[model samples]
Target: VVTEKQQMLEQHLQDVRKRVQDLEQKMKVVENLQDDFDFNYKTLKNQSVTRQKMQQLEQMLTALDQMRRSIVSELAGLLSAMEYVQKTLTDEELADWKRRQQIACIGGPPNICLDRLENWITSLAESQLQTRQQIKKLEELQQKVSYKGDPIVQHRPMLEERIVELFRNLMKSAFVVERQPCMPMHPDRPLVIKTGVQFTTKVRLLVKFPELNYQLKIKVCIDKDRGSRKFNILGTNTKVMNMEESNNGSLSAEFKHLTLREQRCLIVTEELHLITFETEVYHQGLKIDLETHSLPVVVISNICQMPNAWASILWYNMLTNNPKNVNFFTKPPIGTWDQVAEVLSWQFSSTTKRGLSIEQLTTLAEKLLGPGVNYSGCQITWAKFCKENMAGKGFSFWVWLDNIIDLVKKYILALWNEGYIMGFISKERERAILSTKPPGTFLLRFSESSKEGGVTFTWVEKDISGKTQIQSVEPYTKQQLNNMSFAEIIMGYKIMDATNILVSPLVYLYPDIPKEEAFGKYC
Candidate 1:
């Protein structure tokens, strides 16, 4: 009986031990399976997102191209008609036509000859009016075709390419992409005395169970270098640990940094932003300097302004005109003027400041500030004329304002090609200029190019945008101005046309004025 009882106890112990072993093995398998599941899930999710984005980008590009072609075709048709008209009208016919139209409109007491001339004049006038109307309608259609879709179309290709490259990198490693070295949204060689960059990222979260007890830790690494180096100068690291239960898949940060000089590079790597191992290069700095000291002695009186207002004007000019100058700086000038020609073939969109999709500000200018506030348009049109004529024939306010939109587009394309303008927000900078009075006025001075001596011109605001009036200054001529420098042109336009001007407090670079000088007494 004792032996039988001992054997039963041993059997029970064996059974309990075996059961415990089985449980442990099952737990190990479950944990391993969970990790495998997570890996597959992340991969699949990222692939799907990437595919969708690529499709969207392709569609946008196609649409843009098609629209451009249609515009070009239509414009070509219009040109053909215009050409035919030109050929048909001999010089004598043109003169006769003008006379007949004038006579018809000046009808009073009817004479037979007068009546006949009057009828002819009326017919000519109708034809001219019809032609003008047709051209205007076609132009309107072209503008709509040019920018109707996405203003961001200009940068979409780069953006998409970067996004794809980033996604591929993320699949390999864990790193965050940070914006540095100041990437411009507009992708132009923007005036970068004070440069800034924006960084964007997409994040993924993983949860444990129904109770949802889990922790996620992220770490970011930054590498610094100058130009091309085999290795980084130094390395810095930061970590974000133990993320709580949340549903955020992505986040973005805008990092602003000033470039000390040209050809500087900033590299940003994030453990999370877009994904790990994702890297981007923020290129060189664009500095637009209007050295007041560089102004000509003749225009010092007119261009002089308080130091503060003068600086402010420089900033504003750099932003608005940066995009326009990019291409001129980047490419050889002898090539075609239109860079977006393929995309905007028929489209006649412009890059004028006023024509920017900033309807509210323009409306305010037209309504509250009266017609003079249409200075944005005026500035762009003047710039365009400056480009076409290169002879410095200044344009009137109405013509400048009306044609500015077209010119702006042209300028922006130039800025992009040259990489002078970087980064543009599809959203308008409307709030930036919403002061009760205009933010600041710009003073522009143009001088004729000196045939014998070095060409020099100066621009000074009285008070930039009501900031300060120029004390005593001289005027500049377009001939003497630096056409390559967008900053100078902008300052010149503002000085001549911007309203609600505040001349800066008088500051003199030179104390004494020479007798027989062209300058006035205000210093």
Candidate 2:
């Protein structure tokens, strides 16, 4: 029993030793883990500190960038404000500032001392205050000026009279009249006679006296005789209040109809008729005469005579109507029938009253035939031929007239063939055709030297001066021409058909000639 117990104890002791060896191995592994953990903890703490510092540095950089952008923006605004203030400175102020800058730059040579820098800052502040005061004064002046309106509107009457005088001057320059139209008696009033086609007449009156705002009696009459004559009422006497209230102080009287006797008197009278206007203005039982103004009137009359007399009257009227026509007839001959008449007249005696003188023929031909043949060489040759042939012949006045007419007709036909002469529709007929057309289209159709069976269209625009300016031109084919209407042709070509009325030269020179034959042969 004692030996078995001892064996058990030995076995137990071996087991105990094995258990202690296992525990020792586990303690070594645990110590190694603890060392690794302690090292990792220390490394993590240092890394955390580094990350916090990096975050702080990034925030500071962001703040600096923001401050830089804000400073740049403020500098730009300050520069702009300085530039604006600089422009408003006077010459003296600019000179003073330039002197200050020179002193600051040159008074201290290499390095500027602190005292000099402080002086410069003080000078800058003083200048800034002065500039601000100047800006304030300017603003106050602008505010005071804002209440005043246009000076022109305040002196409306004076300006209106000036405009009326200018209009009168324009009329006198552009139109031919027998006498200078007198201004109204009142300085604030204007009187104008507007004349148009035939006997159409309108008397325009402008009254600008705003004080004459009361029941005013206005009378307009015509007097056949200035002396011992009674006033014939032309328009009914009417009462008006505040004539100045109307547009531009404008008032008008238009003659609607005339009695037969009045018409006869106007046509047959030797002297011009007289127009009288009087206004008896009344306000608060006070009466005043707005003075009387008289104007002379002339009317166109129909000719009552033989065919030759009619022709002569027409010729005379044409020259008198426009002064330019008179000058054109009196000037030395160009490619004109006047040259031909001059040569013929030289062949006859100066005292001969057989037909007409060179001057008379020139005046008559200009009206009957426009300026004359377009070809210069042909006109000169014809004049030379007639002069050579009629040198010694004792031709009667009638014979000479017949010969000249025939020669002119032949010359006109030749010019037509050369495409120098153009055919024109009458003014009345042209207007009738144009009225049917759309706006902005001009149609010009006539014979040309090189073109045939086609028309040209031109685009035109009115400029600021109200004159037509040609922008572009386009040529159409024969087919296009055939498709277009007469109105379309007139509109597309930009031709002033209203102003161009073609009176056949042959028809005017030879009044007895047939129109169709004349057109076919000459036009």
lDDT of each: 0.27, 0.32
Worst 10 residues of 2 by lDDT: 171-180
Q: Provide the lowest-lDDT 10-residue window in model 1.
A: 290-299
Give a tens-digit lDDT track for model 1, residues 416-456: 23322212211122222222222232211111222211212
Q: Candidate 2, after superposition: displacement of residue 375 in Å?
A: 17
Q: Candidate 1: which stretches are off by over 4 Å?
A: 1-180, 183-236, 241-336, 340-523
Q: What tens-digit string does per-residue lDDT give for candidate 2 at 1-523?
A: 2245335434433443343344345434433443443444356346787788666545544443343334334323433443333232222233333333222221111222222222222233333333333223323333332223422223333433432332232222211111112222211111122222212223332222345445444454555232222324333334243433333343333333321114323122112344544555443233435533332333223322111221222222222322122222223233334444543342222212132444344433443343653322333322222222333444322234433333223222243233222222233333444444333433232211112222332323344576644322343444554465323433233334344764211211111323344334422
Model 2 spans > 4 angstroms off: 1-207, 224-231, 234-271, 281-295, 298-523
What is the TM-score of each predicted model, taking all chains together? 0.19, 0.22
Residue 229 lDDT (model 2): 23
Scored by lDDT, model 1 comes in at 0.27
Clashing pairs in 2: 441-491, 442-490, 442-491, 442-492, 442-493, 442-494, 443-489, 443-490
